Design a protein around this ligand. Sequence first.
Ligand SMILES: *[C@@H]1O[C@H](CO)[C@@H](O[C@@H]2O[C@H](CO)[C@@H](O[C@@H]3O[C@H](CO)[C@@H](O)[C@H](O)[C@@H]3O)[C@H](O)[C@H]2NC(C)=O)[C@H](O)[C@H]1NC(C)=O
Lengths: 48, 48, 96, 48, 49
Amino acid sequence: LPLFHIALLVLFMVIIYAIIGLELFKGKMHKTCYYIGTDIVATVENEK
Amino acid sequence: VFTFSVGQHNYDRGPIQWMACENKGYYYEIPSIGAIRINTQEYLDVLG
Amino acid sequence: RIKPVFIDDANFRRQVSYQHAAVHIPTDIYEGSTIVLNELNWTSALDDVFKKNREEDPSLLWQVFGSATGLARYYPASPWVDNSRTPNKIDLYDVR
Amino acid sequence: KMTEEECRGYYYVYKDGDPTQMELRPRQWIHNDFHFDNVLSAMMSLFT
Amino acid sequence: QPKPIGVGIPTINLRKRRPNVQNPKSQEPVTLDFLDAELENDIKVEIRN
Ligand SMILES: *[C@@H]1O[C@H](CO)[C@@H](O[C@@H]2O[C@H](CO)[C@@H](O[C@@H]3O[C@H](CO)[C@@H](O)[C@H](O)[C@@H]3O)[C@H](O)[C@H]2NC(C)=O)[C@H](O)[C@H]1NC(C)=O
């Protein structure tokens, strides 16, 4: 029971940060470098 | 009867080995792509 | 290793050497194994028969022994059409 | 290749699992960065 | 002819084609039937048999 306030604070902080990130980084991570004229993503050995 | 065990799995392989070398055959394992070329051609050693 | 002379030739639109025989080992098969080095040890005795076959009939084309270990010894010696990785290309040739 | 002497030469790597798209890589006998070969390396691995 | 025997209709997907992979070309034999090298006729089949 005493951890209810902490959980409420955590939830509200998650909500605020989620909305801030929604306003800042919305639809920005949609470009990656494909190969020439193909649908293949170009990376190196141990790079995601 | 030549039997092939394909892939990486935890299933029992004893029955198919028995099927292989009960009926004058052979048993092969193909765990990856690199194994296919060499394992799908060695059945001609038995036929000779 | 051996460095052949590789004169040009007719009936072969390539450069070939009649002194010895060439050996093709697939890319994914390691040369220098005990299995491989033993094949290269006893199969060498075929070069004399290769040369005798040619000298009996000078119109022979490739004579090749295809080993069960993936080796291929053919006569006359001639560079392989597709070397391993000097260009971006590789070869996928197993005699079996 | 299950031994140091077999792990020699070159082998094919297939990109995106495609059997037709192949490269050549040398075969090398890799040793894990964190191992248990002696007590010091064991303690390092356990610390991680 | 020295060309390889063709089969079906050649379909390729240029969007899944890496530029530096060295895909295989061909390994099939040039098997051309006698009736596929000339005009098929009811007497030529008898002659071939
Ligand atoms: C496979 O490789 C081995 C070793 O390279 C070859 O065996 C070697 O054969 C030569 C000639 O047959 C031997 O030379 C001989 O030495 C004796 C003295 O021991 C001498 O009396 C002879 O007149 C001759 O010079 C050589 O000793 C021998 N090597 C060993 C370690 O025994 C073998 O011939 C190769 N296989 C084929 C098919 O060529």
